[PDB]
Amino acid sequence: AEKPKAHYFNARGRMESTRWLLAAAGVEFEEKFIKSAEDLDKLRNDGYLMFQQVPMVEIDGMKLVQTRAILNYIASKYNLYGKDIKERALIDMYIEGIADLGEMILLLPVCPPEEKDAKLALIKEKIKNRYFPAFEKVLKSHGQDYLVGNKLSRADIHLVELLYYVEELDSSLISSFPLLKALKTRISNLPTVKKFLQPGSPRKPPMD
Amino acid sequence: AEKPKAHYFNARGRMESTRWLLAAAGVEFEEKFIKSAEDLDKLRNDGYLMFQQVPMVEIDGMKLVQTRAILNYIASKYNLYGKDIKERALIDMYIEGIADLGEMILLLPVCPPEEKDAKLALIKEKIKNRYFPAFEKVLKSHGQDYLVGNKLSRADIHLVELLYYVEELDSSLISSFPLLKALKTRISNLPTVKKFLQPGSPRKPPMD
After folding, report:
1. Is residue A85 less than 8 Å (CB to CB) from chain B?
2. Nearest to B69 among A64, A65, A92 (CB)
3. Which of A12, A138, B36, B196 is positioned for an S-S bond with B23, CB 3.0–4.6 A?
4. Is B157 in contact with B187 (CB distance < 8 Å)?
5. Residues of chain B with CATH 3.40.30.10
6. Does domain B81-189 have CATH number 1.20.1050.10?
7. Is the distance from CB of A57 to CB of A6 less than 8 angstroms?
8. What are the chain B neighbours of A60 within 8 Å (beta carbons)?
């Protein structure tokens, strides 16, 4: 009967995409926040962390670490990973590009200050030139409401999460992609995601 | 069966782990080498690279990009991804930890010659303190010949490939881990992997 338990810092970091996915799935979960280095040593010393790191999620009697391992398990368990191996391949290709873009945005605060300007420019170029056009093309190719299989999958969730982060970075970047704008609205208006986006959910704020 | 066709530089890089997995699965595949900037421009312009990047593999009607996407599909198609959602979860956790360590080694040649001694040292400390102990513990916990489900999976293949790279870095690192040494020998002796390690295969040499 035990709800999934997510162990991380009280912050977005590498746990946030899991919070979105669980919420979009309608899954009830607890969080246990790491507040001290003592908290983190105790997880380690208890053997909770296969590679000594968080995020870790306790779910269905496993102690899963590695964001991709957590997410793949959630996605399959809740029917958000496509109908078969070939839909899962499209999903994977899409969401690994999202992950590549997300990683650049995620690590930007820790970019060497003398590299920061150039890096920001390069990031926005890739959004405008590489990533946003790729996803708009997928959407234009089939004219369907969802990225894959005409049904909600983790790819729609991970993409719309990413679109919120790009909006924080620069709200003009999505301007010229109306199908992306339209997906953002539809997905944000799904009861589970609409509730997640409202004040009070486990959704975490940006880092200062 | 249209043979899968892998597009990459004639080099290990980001395609090497897919050549390992394909070869281990007994799958015959063709390669097409990118030799110049023009060669890559053509693939981009031709609409073959979803995110304008290689590796890309033509398989089963798809133009799959993103290493993880490419390998998840191959692993599922050739029954190297465990037999269920929970064995997949253990595989993903193991192989994501493998990718983290392997990413570090992969990028070691392209960092600044002063952030290099410290970076080499840190990699060695992670190998001896974090990664090899984790994998040794899995092998010792069941005593079985393979990481997961008592049967070859992509995890044994990804791990043993990484053991070859750790050996090129420092052949002393594996010395205190007798079960990883036994796995490397056993896996290297399977018919398909023995063939891959012998001359004249798609296996690629270190860069220089």
Report:
1. yes
2. A92
3. B196
4. yes
5. 1-80+190-208
6. yes
7. yes
8. 86
